[PDB]
Design a protein around this ligand. Sequence first.
Ligand SMILES: Nc1nc2c(ncn2[C@@H]2O[C@H](COP(=O)(O)OP(=O)(O)O)[C@@H](O)[C@H]2O)c(=O)[nH]1
Ligand SMILES: [Mg+2]
Length: 169
Amino acid sequence: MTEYKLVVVGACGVGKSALTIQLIQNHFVDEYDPTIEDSYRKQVVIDGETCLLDILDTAGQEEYSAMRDQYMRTGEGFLCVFAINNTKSFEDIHHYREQIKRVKDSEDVPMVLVGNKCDLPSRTVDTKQAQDLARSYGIPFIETSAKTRQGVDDAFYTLVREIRKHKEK
Ligand SMILES: Nc1nc2c(ncn2[C@@H]2O[C@H](COP(=O)(O)OP(=O)(O)O)[C@@H](O)[C@H]2O)c(=O)[nH]1
Ligand SMILES: [Mg+2]
């Protein structure tokens, strides 16, 4: 069956692990070690296609930088996550965008921008500012809550759809 290799990136604490675990296991994890990096696989149906999602939940620095370059080169699409109550996490998106493009040496890399923690009252990044950034990149923007599951399937399935559009060219 078709496999899609997805990589979830973003600053520490934005909800990469909580988003991934909601997708895979359908529960919200309140506490998951910020230093754990692991991969998960799940069979899903997207637009009638039975496929396997192979998802790497990243944790930042690696023992050796070659390990970062390896997952960036093999990954087919990237979920770039910030938290709507953490402006620094939003600013860091610029760094992830640039680094992934540089490792892959490509200007066309399937990516989706995710603003997580949308259930929280505290917000420092309004939707408009994130829409403006996504428009500048030419990629979709989705607001999510790993707690309530709002937008979770959409974020991952939209990324698969972006990979499909890239592959058909
Ligand atoms: N309220 C709320 N809390 C969240 C959400 N996503 C993650 N969290 C919490 O934010 C903290 C960091 O989440 P985590 O998944 O460990 O972030 P990571 O470092 O990016 O993997 C944890 O305490 C989670 O419970 C969300 O959508 N809403
Ligand atoms: Mg984590």
